[PDB]
Amino acid sequence: QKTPQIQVYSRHPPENGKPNILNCYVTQFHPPHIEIQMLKNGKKIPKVEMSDMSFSKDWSFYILAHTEFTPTETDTYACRVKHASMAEPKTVYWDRDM
Amino acid sequence: NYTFRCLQMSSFANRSWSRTDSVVWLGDLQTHRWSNDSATISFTKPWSQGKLSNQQWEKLQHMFQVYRVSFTRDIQELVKMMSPKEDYPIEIQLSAGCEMYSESFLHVAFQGKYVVRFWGTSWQTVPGAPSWLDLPIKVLNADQGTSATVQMLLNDTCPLFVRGLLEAGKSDLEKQEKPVAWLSSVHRQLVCHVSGFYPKPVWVMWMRGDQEQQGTHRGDFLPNADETWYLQATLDVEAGEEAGLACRVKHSSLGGQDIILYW
Ligand SMILES: *[C@@H]1O[C@H](CO[C@@H]2O[C@@H](C)[C@@H](O)[C@@H](O)[C@@H]2O)[C@@H](O[C@@H]2O[C@H](CO)[C@@H](O[C@@H]3O[C@H](CO[C@H]4O[C@H](CO)[C@@H](O)[C@H](O)[C@@H]4O)[C@@H](O)[C@H](O[C@H]4O[C@H](CO)[C@@H](O)[C@H](O)[C@@H]4O)[C@@H]3O)[C@H](O)[C@H]2NC(C)=O)[C@H](O)[C@H]1NC(C)=O
Ligand SMILES: CCCCCCCCCCCCCCCCCCCCCCCCCC(=O)N[C@@H](CO[C@H]1O[C@H](CO)[C@H](O)[C@H](O)[C@H]1O)[C@H](O)[C@H](O)CCCC(=O)Nc1ccc(CCCCC)cc1
Ligand SMILES: *[C@@H]1O[C@H](CO)[C@@H](O)[C@H](O)[C@H]1NC(C)=O
Ligand SMILES: *[C@@H]1O[C@H](CO)[C@@H](O)[C@H](O)[C@H]1NC(C)=O
Ligand code: NA
Ligand code: NA
């Protein structure tokens, strides 16, 4: 059993008030069953698109989630992952730069 | 060099529940998906049929349709025979294809670990694989018709199909997408973010004038959802001495005009 790594980053340079895309890349996990949500101010974002799950040379799974977002200095964004390898859901906050 | 990979992931939860899902990659571009819920293989490019006629494609697809049902039954039968010693839940992964210059491969993993390959004219367990696999592999190897089909698929069908993809997909495979870069920081750490480049080869370096800063740490290549790449390169610097630094990006799409971003 392998624990997911989570990276959160934007498609375009983050500029407050300009629409952009936020990515959540989840990697290095096994087994493949996983639950991934993206959060705006701690609340689940509805329209989140998911890539097909695939796996690497080392057999560990990966998947990309993304969503439209507009950064501002009043909103937080995060990616939350539930997986059997972890007792509780793991949440990674967008660091506002990536 | 292009590597063509067909990736199958099969999850067996209990005797009543299982699914098999596949994806196919040509290098870093996805060309097919085959969901458990679909009877047919889905194209993810307009050129995913390669140079095969509709007839040729239906036949090849048929061979995979028969395979998917046969595989699922074989694993279920195997678990019943081995129970309770080997039992659910079970994950099986297969990675098969060819690398073009060609050489082909077919590797199988059980519970996340490489255990079996097809090589030459037969299936084999790899050294270190659980010994309970030896008997089922021996039995599979008695199936001459399956061996002949697999040898054909790996030695012949795969490189032929991929040569057709390379010609049919030429304009996508040789696409050039330009990076956009930006700088950030929170004794400091400066981060140069580079996003939207294709293809993957890229050069990103912190500079002071013409001097490459050797403390530059390049991150992992991360995918964007639009078949482009993201990378960041970081440099830990002394506070006050940030002025004069710049991030330089070289990429094939830029036509010799590098991005230079001054801090
Ligand atoms: C498909 O290509 C196969 C080779 O390619 C590899 O495997 C495929 C699946 C891809 O992944 C590809 O990328 C790989 O590179 C090819 O397999 C070859 O098949 C021949 C027979 O058809 C085998 O020849 C027999 O070899 C043994 C000795 O094998 C050992 O030693 C050699 C080196 O000396 C090693 O390379 C092997 O790994 C083994 O350690 C001989 O004892 C045997 O001789 C006997 O049989 C012949 C008749 O065939 C008689 O004339 C003799 O008198 C003997 O009685 C064979 O010569 C070869 O080993 C095998 N390669 C490998 C690597 O195992 C396969 O045939 C292709 N199939 C089709 C349909 O195209
Ligand atoms: C591959 C090259 C790609 C070419 C590229 C072209 C483009 C295609 C696009 C692809 C999109 C979909 C990708 C899906 C990924 C799958 C790739 C891997 C396929 C490789 C296996 C193909 C097998 C084809 C033959 C087959 O179907 N055999 C049938 C039926 O056999 C009967 O019928 C035959 C003719 O129809 C013959 O006449 C034969 O003689 C008959 O018996 C068999 O039932 C077999 O057993 C069935 C099971 C075989 C098996 O994989 N078993 C297995 C492997 C490893 C393990 C060990 C692990 C276990 C741990 C517990 C265990 C089991
Ligand atoms: C089999 O596994 C599936 C998927 O987890 C589950 O929904 C179902 O309840 C299980 N069935 C039995 C009979 O245990
Ligand atoms: C996957 O597809 C097979 C064949 O149609 C079906 O029997 C099986 O129930 C499917 N599994 C799930 C979990 O939907
Ligand atoms: Na192989
Ligand atoms: Na596996």
Automatic annotation (TrEMBL), chain B:
It is a single-pass type I membrane protein. One of its GO terms (cellular component) is lysosomal membrane. The lineage of its organism: Eukaryota, Metazoa, Chordata, Craniata, Vertebrata. This is CD1d1 antigen. The chain holds residues 25 to 297 of 336 of the full protein. Antigen-presenting protein that binds self and non-self glycolipids and presents them to T-cell receptors on natural killer T-cells. It comes from the Eukaryota. It comes from Mus musculus (Mouse). Heterodimer with B2M (beta-2-microglobulin). Interacts with MHC II and CD74. One of its GO terms (biological process) is positive regulation of interleukin-2 production. The keyword S-adenosyl-L-methionine does not apply. Residues 179-253 form the Ig-like domain. Its main location: membrane. Keywords: Cell membrane, Endosome, Glycoprotein, Immunity, Immunoglobulin domain, Innate immunity, Lysosome, Membrane, Signal, Transmembrane, Transmembrane helix. The keyword Membrane applies. It is found in: Cell membrane; Endosome membrane; Lysosome membrane.
